[PDB]
Design a protein around this ligand. Structure first.
Ligand SMILES: Nc1ncnc2c1ncn2[C@@H]1O[C@H](COP(=O)(O)OP(=O)(O)OP(=O)(O)O)[C@@H](O)[C@H]1O
Ligand SMILES: O=C(O)c1cc(-c2cccc(Br)c2)nc2c(F)cccc12
Length: 259
C-alpha cells in the first residue's frame, strides 16, 4: 500500500549502516518526510532482517513527542524503504561537533526529554539499547527525538563502538531496562565533556574501561552533575536509579527548562 513512485526524493539526510536516509515528499499530499533506504543484499550478507522487521514493529507502535514516528514501509527489487518523520534540525551528534560541549541547561533538558521517551518505551517493556548522539534527532522546536530502533528489543534479552553499552551487554550477560540508564549517564557525561566517559583508541581498551567503570570528571563538571553521572554509571544494574529518580534529580529539576 505504498510505492517509490508516490515520493519525490530530495537531498541525503545522513548515512546509515545498510543505506542512506533521504529527504522526500509524498506527491499527493505534499508531505515532508525522511525515507530510510536499506539494500536487501547488504542486510542479507549480514543476516539482520531479523531486527529490521523488529525495528518496524517496535517503531510503528510508539507514540510520544520525544520518539521519531514511523509512518510505514514498502520494498522493491533490491531496496527496503522506511517512511519516517523528518527531524529538520539534524542530530545531537552534529550539534555537539559545532558547540564542542553543552551547558547544564541544554544537557538537563535533553536528559529530561530522554527520560520521558525512555519511561514510555520501558512502560511497553521496550529497551532501546542503541542510545547514541548519532540516533538523537532534533525537531523544529529543538526537541529531542529518539530514532533508530534497529537494536531495540523486548525486556529481558541476551556491531559498532562499545562506548554507550553497559558492562552486562559487552560481557554478553543478561539485560533489561537498566541498560538504557547506563546510556543516559554516558550521554549526560558526553554532553558536558564533549567526549564519552570510556572513549579509547581501541575497542579493546574501551571494553576494559567499561567493565571496570574507569571514568574521571574534568574540573568544570559541577557536583550536581558528578552525582547523577556516578549514580547512573553503576556496574551493578540493580544499583542504577529509575527514570523517575532521574527526572526528579535536583541538578535535573534545577537546570531543565520545562515546556
Ligand atoms: N527522520 C530523519 N530526519 C533527519 N535525519 C535522519 C532521519 N533519520 C535518520 N537520519 C540521519 O541519517 C543517519 C542514519 O540514521 P539511522 O540511525 O536511522 O540509520 P542506521 O544507523 O543505519 O540505523 P540502524 O541502527 O538500524 O542501522 C543518521 O546519522 C541521522 O542523522
Ligand atoms: O525476500 C524478499 O523479497 C525480502 C523482503 C523484505 C521485506 C519485506 C517486507 C517488509 C520488510 Br521490513 C522487509 N526484506 C528483505 C531483506 F531485508 C533482505 C533480503 C530479502 C528481503
Amino acid at each position: 500500500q505504498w510505492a517509490l513512485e508516490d515520493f519525490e526524493i530530495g537531498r541525503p539526510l545522513g548515512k546509515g549502516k545498510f543505506g542512506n536516509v533521504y529527504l522526500a515528499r509524498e506527491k499527493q499530499s505534499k508531505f515532508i518526510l525522511a525515507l530510510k533506504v536499506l539494500f536487501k543484499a547488504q542486510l542479507e550478507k549480514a543476516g539482520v532482517e531479523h531486527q529490521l522487521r523488529r525495528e518496524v514493529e517496535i517503531q510503528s507502535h510508539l507514540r510520544h513527542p520525544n520518539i521519531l514516528r514511523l509512518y510505514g514501509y514498502f520494498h522493491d527489487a533490491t531496496r527496503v524503504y522506511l517512511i519516517l518523520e523528518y527531524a529538520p534540525l539534524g542530530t545531537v551528534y552534529r550539534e555537539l561537533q559545532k558547540l564542542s560541549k553543552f551547558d547544564e541547561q541544554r544537557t538537563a533538558t535533553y536528559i529530561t526529554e530522554l527520560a520521558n521517551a525512555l519511561s514510555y518505551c520501558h512502560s511497553k517493556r521496550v529497551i532501546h539499547r542503541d542510545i547514541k548522539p548519532e540516533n538523537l534527532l532534533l525537531g523544529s522546536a529543538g526537541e529531542l527525538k529518539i530514532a533508530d530502533f534497529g537494536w531495540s528489543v523486548h525486556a529481558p534479552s541476551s556491531c559498532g563502538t562499545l562506548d554507550y553499552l553497559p558492562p552486562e551487554m559487552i560481557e554478553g550477560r543478561m539485560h533489561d531496562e537498566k541498560v538504557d540508564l547506563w546510556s543516559l549517564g554516558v550521554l549526560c557525561y558526553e554532553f558536558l565533556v564533549g567526549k564519552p566517559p570510556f572513549e579509547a583508541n581501541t575497542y579493546q581498551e574501551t571494553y576494559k574501561r567499561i567493565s571496570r567503570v574507569e571514568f574521571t570528571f574534568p574540573d568544570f563538571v559541577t557536583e550536581g552533575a558528578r552525582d547523577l553521572i556516578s549514580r547512573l554509571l553503576k556496574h551493578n544494574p540493580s544499583q542504577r536509579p529509575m527514570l523517575r529518580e532521574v527526572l526528579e534529580h535536583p541538578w535535573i529539576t534545577a537546570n531543565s527548562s520545562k515546556p
